[PDB]
């Protein structure tokens, strides 16, 4: 009566280790990743359903620890700048500036070690205001002198995002859901199977989500709990909004030897006038896109609810501004110029600041020093979504953001990992 079958098409939810596939020694060691399967076959599954939960998806946790581990490994074999944490003697940069840049740059002189242990040299460099702390012309310290070590990033290792594909080991499969009305949880009927996902760009940002995937059928609004004001709301656009960012100053760079075999890259002088860094967003596009978000957002509050976007909530720059990583520079842009409307029933210019000393993972640990880059940086990118948080007829939303194990969460919401279980039994009418 008992017949044993092998190769039965069933599975259980499971957690396993995923490995990557992809495609000059960049920050994510993509040359160490296996080659992709070109033209992989996607297999649609007819007459199946499955349940998903993007807020409990362990693929997010692996992407989180993979990116952090890679960041730290890549910065490990790089020159330390410990000898640079000295008393600095600084004055203001005033010779060729606009008023908006007055006080933004400082000219600092200091006594630094030469390759010979017994000799010192007088050198100077420029620093941005945000990296320099006054002690009492005036004496200064770098911002991390009493908190952590500063390591200079290696100049040969780039940071631009490179798509990384996550692949399951044999015996496991990835279920991708196509239901275009899926809100992040529960039954999601249009399921297909892939062995390895498409590439995801490991972009790190706050408030605005850049260079991600787009929605199609509608703007999607997803949250763990809509009525819980302690949770974030992820909004995915079905159209991109284009932005253009610039340095715009023409920078120079010089090397200082600080010991045998090691050098520090100092910001040199500036060619031409000094102007403030900034980002432009097309105004009409932003105006229309925001209206689409509101129409859809109202479905969870009522047709008589007024939606206001107020302003940024306040706090440290890392959580109040738009953290933008581009061209090898770290930008902190003022988004109050975007989120300024109330909804009832040209270009926008966002002034932006630059920092060289970066605490990338919002932790106390080794800080990275971004070496200066010569020439002029020009960045073009797509806003694919945004993060909102919510504070009796008017609801208030704010950019919020700042959370890690987010952003990537908007790319991995479509996937679940399952374990294949080939054996099973059933009754029939045979005997040996």
């Amino acid at each position, epitope marked *: 009566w008992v017949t044993v079958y092998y190769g039965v098409p069933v599975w259980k939810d499971a957690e396993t280790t995923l490995f990557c596939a992809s495609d000059k020694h960049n920050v994510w060691a993509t040359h160490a990743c296996v080659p992709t399967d070109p033209n992989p076959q996607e297999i*649609h599954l007819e007459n199946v359903t499955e349940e998903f939960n993007m807020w409990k998806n362990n693929m997010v946790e692996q992407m989180h620890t993979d990116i952090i581990s890679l960041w730290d490994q890549s910065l490990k074999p790089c020159v330390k700048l410990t000898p640079l944490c000295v008393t600095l003697q600084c004055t203001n940069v005033t010779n060729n500036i606009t008023d908006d840049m007055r006080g933004e740059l400082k000219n600092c002189s200091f006594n630094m070690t030469t390759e010979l242990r017994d000799k010192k040299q007088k050198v100077y460099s420029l620093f941005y205001r945000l990296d320099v702390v006054q002690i009492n012309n005036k004496e200064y310290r770098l911002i991390n002198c009493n908190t952590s070590a500063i390591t200079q990033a290696c100049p040969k290792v780039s940071f631009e995002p490179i798509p990384i594909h996550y692949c399951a080991p044999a015996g496991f499969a990835i279920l991708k*859901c196509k239901d*275009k*009305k899926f809100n992040g949880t529960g039954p999601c*009927p*249009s399921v297909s199977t892939v062995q390895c996902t498409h590439g995801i760009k490991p972009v790190v940002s706050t408030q605005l989500l850049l260079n991600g995937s787009l929605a*199609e059928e509608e703007v999607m609004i997803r949250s763990e709990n809509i009525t819980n004001n302690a949770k974030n709301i992820l909004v995915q656009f079905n159209t991109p909004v284009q932005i253009n960012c610039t340095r715009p100053n023409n920078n120079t760079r010089k090397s200082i030897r600080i010991g045998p075999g090691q050098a520090f890259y100092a910001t040199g002088d500036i060619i031409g006038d000094i102007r403030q860094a900034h980002c432009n967003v097309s105004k009409a596009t932003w105006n229309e896109t925001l209206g689409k978000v509101v129409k859809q957002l109202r479905k969870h509050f009522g047709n008589n609810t007024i939606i206001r976007f107020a302003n940024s909530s306040g706090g440290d720059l890392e959580v109040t501004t738009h953290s933008f990583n581009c061209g090898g520079e770290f930008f902190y842009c003022n988004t109050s110029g975007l989120f300024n409307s109330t909804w009832i029933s040209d270009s926008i210019t966002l002034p932006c600041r630059i920092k060289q000393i970066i605490n990338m993972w919002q932790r106390i640990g080794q800080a990275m020093y971004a070496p200066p880059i010569q020439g002029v940086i020009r960045c073009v990118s797509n806003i694919t979504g945004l993060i909102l948080t919510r504070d009796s007829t008017t609801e208030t939303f704010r950019p919020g953001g700042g959370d890690m194990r987010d952003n990537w969460r908007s790319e991995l919401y479509k996937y679940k990992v399952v374990k294949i279980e080939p054996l099973g039994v059933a009754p029939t009418r045979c005997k040996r």
Partner: antibody
Amino acid sequence: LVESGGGLVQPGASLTLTCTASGFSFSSDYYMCWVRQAPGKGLEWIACIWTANSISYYARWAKGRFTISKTSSTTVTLQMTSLTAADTATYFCARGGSGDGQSLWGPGTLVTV
Amino acid sequence: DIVMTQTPASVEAAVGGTVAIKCQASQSIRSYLAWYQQKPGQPPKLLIYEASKLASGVPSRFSGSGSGTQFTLTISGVECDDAATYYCQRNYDSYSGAYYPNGFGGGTE
């Protein structure tokens, strides 16, 4: 909305129909769909295009013969090729949206092959 | 791919009596069935969407319900403005994941 085009053609001919917005524009949240109804028949579906990102879907019977596209913020067209006598029908455009049927229908056009 | 059959063909009733029209499918289309009314010479009017919701402009005599693969349109009483055929439209594509108005079954008065 409003519609235009149509007329008498011979088999092997191509004919393009045009439908346009009136009192509205092609904001993201709409589908422009084309359907057909022969004089003695019920409704048949041909194709739908989603305004954002110009994404189309087609009936299998229509594949390779009927092309649907967005040409402007107000205009959507249907290009029919390799027409035969069997394609004589009233053609209609209508506007729908996600999760629903078409709610806005125009007077149709007449195509005779 | 898409199977839609309207079965109670050629049903009519005297004014004051009632009628019902029903459709079946080989694939579930839960809560994604739309009903239309087509009077001669007119484009179809949307009556009911998402199985049970009435469209704006639709008289209270129209109603209906269903789920899965079994759905019905009902008329609470004939008012002599029912001289139309009715159609079933599917608003869900099980292969693409999209929810657009693809495919009809129908033709019953």
